[PDB]
Each structure stands twice: as structure tokens, then as C-alpha cells.
Scaffold this active site. Sequence first.
Site, PDB file in Angstrom:
ATOM      1  N   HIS B  51     -21.229  -6.026  23.430  1.00 35.33           N
ATOM      2  CA  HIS B  51     -20.454  -7.457  23.519  1.00 35.33           C
ATOM      3  C   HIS B  51     -19.218  -7.347  24.119  1.00 35.33           C
ATOM      4  CE1 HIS B  51     -17.890  -6.373  19.805  1.00 35.33           C
ATOM      5  NE2 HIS B  51     -18.933  -5.295  19.962  1.00 35.33           N
ATOM      6  N   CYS B 146      -6.871   7.828  28.892  1.00 37.46           N
ATOM      7  CA  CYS B 146      -8.235   8.143  29.226  1.00 37.46           C
ATOM      8  C   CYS B 146      -8.366   7.586  30.661  1.00 37.46           C
ATOM      9  CB  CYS B 146      -9.142   7.856  28.331  1.00 37.46           C
ATOM     10  SG  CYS B 146      -8.987   8.450  26.543  1.00 37.46           S
ATOM     11  N   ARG B 166      -9.670  10.704  32.944  1.00 36.40           N
ATOM     12  CA  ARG B 166      -9.665  12.116  33.162  1.00 36.40           C
ATOM     13  C   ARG B 166     -10.453  12.521  31.855  1.00 36.40           C
ATOM     14  NH1 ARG B 166      -7.474  13.593  28.350  1.00 36.40           N
ATOM     15  NH2 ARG B 166      -6.419  11.382  27.464  1.00 36.40           N
ATOM     16  N   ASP B 169     -15.739  10.026  26.855  1.00 36.13           N
ATOM     17  CA  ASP B 169     -16.725  10.190  25.771  1.00 36.13           C
ATOM     18  C   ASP B 169     -18.129   9.405  26.217  1.00 36.13           C
ATOM     19  OD1 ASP B 169     -18.465  10.208  23.607  1.00 36.13           O
ATOM     20  OD2 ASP B 169     -17.579   8.634  22.525  1.00 36.13           O
ATOM     21  N   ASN B 177     -15.320   1.329  28.721  1.00 34.40           N
ATOM     22  CA  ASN B 177     -14.525   1.393  29.999  1.00 34.40           C
ATOM     23  C   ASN B 177     -15.019   0.823  31.211  1.00 34.40           C
ATOM     24  OD1 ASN B 177     -13.874   4.791  28.746  1.00 34.40           O
ATOM     25  ND2 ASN B 177     -12.369   3.000  28.939  1.00 34.40           N
ATOM     26  N   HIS B 207     -17.733  14.473  28.873  1.00 31.77           N
ATOM     27  CA  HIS B 207     -18.545  15.228  28.017  1.00 31.77           C
ATOM     28  C   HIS B 207     -19.339  14.300  26.899  1.00 31.77           C
ATOM     29  CE1 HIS B 207     -14.470  13.606  26.706  1.00 31.77           C
ATOM     30  NE2 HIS B 207     -14.980  13.375  25.615  1.00 31.77           N
ATOM     31  N   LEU B 208     -20.329  14.818  26.269  1.00 28.48           N
ATOM     32  CA  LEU B 208     -21.120  14.283  25.221  1.00 28.48           C
ATOM     33  C   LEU B 208     -21.074  15.027  24.141  1.00 28.48           C
ATOM     34  CD1 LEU B 208     -23.073  12.114  25.793  1.00 28.48           C
ATOM     35  CD2 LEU B 208     -24.803  13.675  26.482  1.00 28.48           C
ATOM     36  N   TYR B 209     -20.408  14.041  23.148  1.00 32.95           N
ATOM     37  CA  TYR B 209     -20.078  14.784  21.713  1.00 32.95           C
ATOM     38  C   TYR B 209     -21.335  15.243  20.903  1.00 32.95           C
ATOM     39  CZ  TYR B 209     -15.234  13.378  21.629  1.00 32.95           C
ATOM     40  OH  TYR B 209     -13.876  13.314  22.149  1.00 32.95           O
ATOM     41  N   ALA B 263     -15.398  10.463  17.314  1.00 33.89           N
ATOM     42  CA  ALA B 263     -14.363  11.792  17.303  1.00 33.89           C
ATOM     43  C   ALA B 263     -12.949  11.511  17.138  1.00 33.89           C
ATOM     44  CB  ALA B 263     -14.966  12.625  18.309  1.00 33.89           C
TER      45      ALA B 263
HETATM   46  C1  LIG Z   1     -13.146   2.766  25.332  1.00 35.00           C
HETATM   47  C2  LIG Z   1     -12.431   2.344  24.398  1.00 35.00           C
HETATM   48  C3  LIG Z   1     -11.786   1.607  23.372  1.00 35.00           C
HETATM   49  N1  LIG Z   1     -11.854   2.318  22.107  1.00 35.00           N
HETATM   50  C4  LIG Z   1     -10.792   3.380  22.280  1.00 35.00           C
HETATM   51  C5  LIG Z   1     -11.372   4.975  21.937  1.00 35.00           C
HETATM   52  C6  LIG Z   1     -10.475   5.792  21.308  1.00 35.00           C
HETATM   53  C7  LIG Z   1     -10.818   7.061  20.893  1.00 35.00           C
HETATM   54  C8  LIG Z   1     -12.093   7.440  21.458  1.00 35.00           C
HETATM   55  N2  LIG Z   1     -12.831   8.902  21.000  1.00 35.00           N
HETATM   56  C9  LIG Z   1     -13.745   9.150  21.362  1.00 35.00           C
HETATM   57  N3  LIG Z   1     -14.372  10.400  20.746  1.00 35.00           N
HETATM   58  N4  LIG Z   1     -14.686   8.462  22.340  1.00 35.00           N
HETATM   59  C10 LIG Z   1     -14.311   7.076  22.643  1.00 35.00           C
HETATM   60  O1  LIG Z   1     -14.895   6.663  23.497  1.00 35.00           O
HETATM   61  C11 LIG Z   1     -13.105   6.405  22.001  1.00 35.00           C
HETATM   62  C12 LIG Z   1     -12.588   5.079  22.469  1.00 35.00           C
HETATM   63  C13 LIG Z   1     -13.013   2.210  21.104  1.00 35.00           C
HETATM   64  C14 LIG Z   1     -12.911   2.953  19.965  1.00 35.00           C
HETATM   65  C15 LIG Z   1     -13.901   2.915  19.162  1.00 35.00           C
HETATM   66  C16 LIG Z   1     -15.063   2.381  19.545  1.00 35.00           C
HETATM   67  C17 LIG Z   1     -16.191   2.240  18.664  1.00 35.00           C
HETATM   68  O2  LIG Z   1     -16.458   2.956  17.681  1.00 35.00           O
HETATM   69  N5  LIG Z   1     -17.328   1.649  19.050  1.00 35.00           N
HETATM   70  C18 LIG Z   1     -18.595   1.500  18.365  1.00 35.00           C
HETATM   71  C19 LIG Z   1     -19.078   0.048  17.335  1.00 35.00           C
HETATM   72  C20 LIG Z   1     -18.985  -0.816  18.783  1.00 35.00           C
HETATM   73  C21 LIG Z   1     -19.510  -2.227  17.985  1.00 35.00           C
HETATM   74  O3  LIG Z   1     -19.014  -3.013  17.065  1.00 35.00           O
HETATM   75  O4  LIG Z   1     -20.638  -2.601  18.460  1.00 35.00           O
HETATM   76  C22 LIG Z   1     -19.842   1.901  19.203  1.00 35.00           C
HETATM   77  O5  LIG Z   1     -20.597   2.836  18.835  1.00 35.00           O
HETATM   78  O6  LIG Z   1     -20.079   1.207  20.305  1.00 35.00           O
HETATM   79  C23 LIG Z   1     -15.143   1.789  20.670  1.00 35.00           C
HETATM   80  C24 LIG Z   1     -13.870   1.765  21.686  1.00 35.00           C
HETATM   81  C1  LIG Z   2     -10.452   7.785  25.605  1.00 34.52           C
HETATM   82  C2  LIG Z   2     -10.420   6.051  25.210  1.00 34.52           C
HETATM   83  C3  LIG Z   2     -11.356   5.766  26.337  1.00 34.52           C
HETATM   84  O1  LIG Z   2     -10.559   4.342  27.009  1.00 34.52           O
HETATM   85  N1  LIG Z   2     -12.225   6.055  26.891  1.00 34.52           N
HETATM   86  C4  LIG Z   2     -12.804   7.370  26.310  1.00 34.52           C
HETATM   87  O2  LIG Z   2     -14.059   7.531  26.794  1.00 34.52           O
HETATM   88  N2  LIG Z   2     -11.977   7.933  25.909  1.00 34.52           N
HETATM   89  C5  LIG Z   2     -12.440   9.269  24.967  1.00 34.52           C
HETATM   90  C6  LIG Z   2     -12.351  10.514  25.833  1.00 34.52           C
HETATM   91  C7  LIG Z   2     -12.243  11.709  24.792  1.00 34.52           C
HETATM   92  O3  LIG Z   2     -13.593  11.964  24.442  1.00 34.52           O
HETATM   93  C8  LIG Z   2     -11.538  10.815  23.610  1.00 34.52           C
HETATM   94  C9  LIG Z   2     -10.044  11.190  23.958  1.00 34.52           C
HETATM   95  O4  LIG Z   2     -10.126  12.470  24.097  1.00 34.52           O
HETATM   96  P1  LIG Z   2      -8.826  13.313  24.633  1.00 34.52           P
HETATM   97  O5  LIG Z   2      -7.568  12.420  24.446  1.00 34.52           O
HETATM   98  O6  LIG Z   2      -8.887  13.591  26.038  1.00 34.52           O
HETATM   99  O7  LIG Z   2      -8.700  14.604  23.781  1.00 34.52           O
HETATM  100  O8  LIG Z   2     -11.715   9.293  23.976  1.00 34.52           O
END
Ligand SMILES: C#CCN(Cc1ccc2[nH]c(N)nc(=O)c2c1)c1ccc(C(=O)N[C@@H](CCC(=O)O)C(=O)O)cc1
Ligand SMILES: *c1cc(=O)[nH]c(=O)n1[C@H]1C[C@H](O)[C@@H](COP(=O)(O)O)O1
EC number: 2.1.1.45
Lengths: 264, 264
Positions: B51, B146, B166, B169, B177, B207-209, B263
Site C-alpha cells: 500500500h 540507506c 548503500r 534489505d 524504497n 542483502h537478504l536477511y 532487523a
Molecule cells: C524502507 C523504509 C521505511 N522503513 C525504514 C526501515 C528501517 C530499518 C530497516 N531495517 C531492515 N532490516 N530493513 C528495512 O527495510 C528497514 C526499513 C520501514 C521500516 C519497517 C517496515 C516494516 O516493518 N514493514 C512491514 C509491514 C508493512 C505493512 O504494514 O504492510 C512489511 O513487511 O512490509 C517498513 C518500512
Molecule cells: C534502510 C532503510 C531504507 O530506507 N531501506 C532499507 O532497505 N534499509 C535497510 C538496509 C539495511 O538492511 C537496514 C539498515 O542497515 P544498516 O544501517 O546499513 O546497518 O535497513
Amino acid sequence: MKQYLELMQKVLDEGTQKNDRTGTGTLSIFGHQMRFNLQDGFPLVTTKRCHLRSIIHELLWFLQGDTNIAYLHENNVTIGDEWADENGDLGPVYGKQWRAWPTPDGRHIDQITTVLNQLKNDPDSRRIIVSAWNVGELDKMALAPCHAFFQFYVADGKLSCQLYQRSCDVFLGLPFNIASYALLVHMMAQQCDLEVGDFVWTGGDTHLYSNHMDQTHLQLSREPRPLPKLIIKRKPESIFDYRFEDFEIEGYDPHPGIKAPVAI
Amino acid sequence: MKQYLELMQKVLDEGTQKNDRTGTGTLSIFGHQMRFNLQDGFPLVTTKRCHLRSIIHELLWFLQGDTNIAYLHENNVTIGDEWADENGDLGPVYGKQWRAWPTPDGRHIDQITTVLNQLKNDPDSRRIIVSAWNVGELDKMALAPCHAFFQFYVADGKLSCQLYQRSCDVFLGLPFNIASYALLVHMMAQQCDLEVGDFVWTGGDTHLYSNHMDQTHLQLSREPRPLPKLIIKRKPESIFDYRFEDFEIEGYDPHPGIKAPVAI
Ligand SMILES: C#CCN(Cc1ccc2[nH]c(N)nc(=O)c2c1)c1ccc(C(=O)N[C@@H](CCC(=O)O)C(=O)O)cc1
Ligand SMILES: *c1cc(=O)[nH]c(=O)n1[C@H]1C[C@H](O)[C@@H](COP(=O)(O)O)O1
Ligand SMILES: C#CCN(Cc1ccc2[nH]c(N)nc(=O)c2c1)c1ccc(C(=O)N[C@@H](CCC(=O)O)C(=O)O)cc1
Ligand SMILES: *c1cc(=O)[nH]c(=O)n1[C@H]1C[C@H](O)[C@@H](COP(=O)(O)O)O1
């Protein structure tokens, strides 16, 4: 080399005529990427002779945080001549940002040292970056950073790096840049006791100058030759102690060189 | 989306076991690039229900230079709760740098407005850029950018953009993104009477967690479906005057959604 020649042909095939700052005209594509496994040989274009000497000096010039072409002239390097001012000053470009990024509160960030430390004590970090794109000083630079953003990466004992070049003169500049960073990877890899990995090159406005067409076609008609081998005759105490005499190139049998006018 | 599924599949075959600042573990590759011609449709993943709401609020949040999770929390967007402080502050992240990047001499650069003008008056410019990687402030930020650096480009009346991410996930962030920038492009485009071109995505540590493997195989078994179409119902008088109710998505018929852990 193959990736390079293929990039030339790619621009030729789907590039768009676009006017530009210099007023020379280009044929450009936006966004591109290629990879060089440094373990296959130092990526130094062979379809035309290249002076690895001028590349070394520009790099050592950066690592010292210098931005006045004076040192360059000291070694007969004229690459900054058409843009430096009367005092040979280009401004707070590459070097200054690399070794001394000025913070608004008084500090000075030495990014090369930061990356080194990370590579040694935290190679897993995804934030091992060096940026020359300091928005706060752009207007002061005599020219905007072409190679503006690069990242390091380590895996299985191999060091890799990817460069983001926002603007790229495929014929005249790209070859310099590729050799530059490739060179930096070896050095960093040597100081961090790591092997060399891949140098990923990524581009923004990848263009071929209207007055570089004839030369491009000439190079593109030549068969690439085996990639040479970088030789560092000594391991300095720090990444800031390398000198032009420490580098050696072996097996470089390039085709005749090709001259072209640079857009100022 | 095809490209996205190809990247996801690549990380599986060629990925390497790594360790991250989150003791989660990962399988990654370094350096990748995908292309999304916005003319073919809004790049919103279909092999998983998604969404725009959250993505929309974040971008509008960024565009306002806001860096406090109040706006997000308000409309129930949690993406940034796990890192803000007791006051809802994330520090000078994305939005701060986008609208007010602090120079070393008491001034602030509004990179957005700058680009807006560059596209309207100097579209052939190869310096239309926006960066959130302000080296002098990376230590005041709760989290390192990121999507740290992106560039714009014009050709044949079409606005294109490339993003250098850079750290990425692949399962969780990538989809967010991708659609996020795509949206910004459409917005910048409308604001400049241009048409949308390509969104070039480039990544560093892709990467892929390790704790996302199951949902990755699930998504890989699905067949991507036609991309939806974006509809902006209003044309604000400023790229900063957009409202959530201005966006629509038509034709989005995704597979069921997939839940995964973040993560920290
Ligand atoms: C990018 C960005 C902004 N952010 C910033 C953000 C911060 C740290 C991150 N950490 C990691 N390991 N990966 C990310 O992609 C990540 C993204 C987000 C943070 C969480 C979710 C999230 O948990 N989404 C779930 C539930 C979504 C839903 O309600 O449908 C999902 O699986 O989609 C999405 C965006
Ligand atoms: C950061 C937030 C975003 O807008 N998009 C994401 O994919 N990322 C992911 C990358 C990484 O898995 C994690 C941040 O990790 P680090 O800060 O590089 O250690 O969020
Ligand atoms: C990249 C970079 C560093 N630089 C910096 C630099 C500065 C402005 C630029 N401007 C443009 N339009 N093209 C570039 O690639 C470029 C590069 C260089 C600048 C010029 C030459 C050059 O014209 N070399 C010629 C002549 C060589 C000689 O004097 O012997 C050549 O044929 O190579 C090389 C490198
Ligand atoms: C800049 C210097 C470099 O390190 N490599 C290059 O390819 N370039 C080229 C790009 C462009 O043709 C010119 C810079 O001009 P602009 O700032 O993009 O207008 O040099």
C-alpha cells in the site's frame, strides 16, 4: 577492455543528443553499471595507450587532501590546468573532502582514515563510505565532483568498492577514473591485509562528446589486449605513504594512443 | 515485479553469508542495478500485497524537512519508531538534509528547491543531485541514510532519476524504497511539466536477511502481475504542498501480503 568498449557502443546505440555546459554537445544515456574483477588484471584500457603515471599522481594528490595543482605541475600533470585559478586553486574539491570535510561546528572529518579503521575493525559495516559531494561547499569548487560517491565492501577476505560517477566523459575521463579507484582498492587492500575483490562502476549522465565520435569508432575497431598487472614494490606504513615509485605496471601492451579535445 | 524477483533470486544463488550490526545474519552481494521505466506503470510490487499510505506519509514527511516521528506516528506509520528517542527525534536524517543541509558557515541548502530550478532552467545539467550523506552530521543521526544519494536527468521531455542505496534489505525495504522514489519522480515531473522516464535503482550491500528466507521462497513462487497506474488528483502550486489525498493507484491486483520481522 571489453566492458569499456561495450559501454562505448551502448551509448552509440541508445544515447540521446543533449546540449551541455561546455557547449560541445554529447550523446548520452543515464544510468549504467559494469564490474571488474581486479583479480583478472589491473583494469587499464588497452585499446589506446594510457599514462598510468598521471593517474597515480592525481590519486596521491587526493590522499594528501591537496587541492592546488601546484603539486601536480611538480610532476608534470596538467589535468587541472584548464580549471585551476591563477594560484592553481580548484577549491575544496576531492582532496579536501576526502581528508578534511569541514563540519559546521569546527571538526574536520578524515574519511579515508574512517574507512580504513572500519575495514580493519568492522569490515561488515554497510556504512563504509567516502563522499566528495559536500553540498555546503559546491559553489566554492571550481568544478563539481565527477566521481562523487564510493563505497567499500568486504567478503571472503576480498575488498571491493563501487563508485558512483554522476557525470562521465566516456572517452577521455572514464579510463582515468576506472584506473584511479582500481588503484585505490589495491592500496587499501594492501594496508588492510586483504585480497582485491571487484570494482563496481556505476554512472549517471554517461556521455560521449560530439568531438570524440571519430576517436571512439577508431578504438571500438581495435581488439582489446590482455589486462596488465599492478605491482606495488613496497608496503608503506600507511595509506598516506605511497609514492609514485612504489607502483609498477607489467604486461601492458596497449594499442597506439588516441588524442581528443577536452570540453572545458 | 520481474526485476525485483530477479534481484531476490540473485541474492539467493550468488549471495554470501555475512553478519550485520543486528545479530540477524544475512546473505548478500555487492553492487546491482535495475531499471524501471515509469511509462510502463508504477513500480509497486504485485507478488505481495502493499500500500502507498505509509510510503506517501514518509515522502511528504521528508519533503517538509521533518525528522520527528510525530507526523508518522500520528497517521500510524511505525517505520521509524524503533530508532527515535524519548522525544520522537531521529536527528538530522533524510528530510533535514533534503530541505536544509547546513553549510560550514551558518547557511542552509534546500537541495529540493535547487533541483526544482535546475530542471526548469538547466535540464541538460549533469549536476542535478540530492544527498543525505552529510558526513559532518552522520553522528547526530539515529540511523545512517540507506537511500543516501540520488540524481535527476532530462531527455526528450522525460524526467528520470537514479538512487544509490548503500544498504538495502531486499525483502522488506526495497519495495518501500522503489515505490518511494518512483513517487517523487512523478511529483517532480508534474511540478516541472515533464513526463516520467526511468527510475534507475543501484545498490551497494544488497542483502537478504537470514530470517526472511521462508517468505522469500514464497514470493518467488508467485507470478508478477500487471503494474498499477498512479493518479495524482491535484497539481499543488509547490512540490511542498502535496496532501495524502492527492494520490491514487488504479489496477493494483496483488497476491496476498507477506509478513516479516524487521532487523533492529
Ligand atoms: C524502507 C523504509 C521505511 N522503513 C525504514 C526501515 C528501517 C530499518 C530497516 N531495517 C531492515 N532490516 N530493513 C528495512 O527495510 C528497514 C526499513 C520501514 C521500516 C519497517 C517496515 C516494516 O516493518 N514493514 C512491514 C509491514 C508493512 C505493512 O504494514 O504492510 C512489511 O513487511 O512490509 C517498513 C518500512
Ligand atoms: C534502510 C532503510 C531504507 O530506507 N531501506 C532499507 O532497505 N534499509 C535497510 C538496509 C539495511 O538492511 C537496514 C539498515 O542497515 P544498516 O544501517 O546499513 O546497518 O535497513
Ligand atoms: C579524468 C580525469 C582527470 N582530468 C580531470 C578532468 C577535468 C575536466 C574534464 N572535462 C571533460 N569534458 N572531460 C573530462 O574527462 C575531464 C576530466 C583530466 C582532464 C583532462 C585530460 C586530458 O585532456 N587528457 C588528454 C591529453 C593528455 C596529455 O596532456 O598528454 C588525453 O588525451 O588523455 C585528462 C584528465
Ligand atoms: C569530470 C572529471 C572526471 O573525474 N571524470 C569525467 O568523466 N568528468 C567529465 C564529465 C563531464 O564531461 C565533465 C564535467 O562536466 P560537468 O560538471 O558534468 O558539466 O568532465
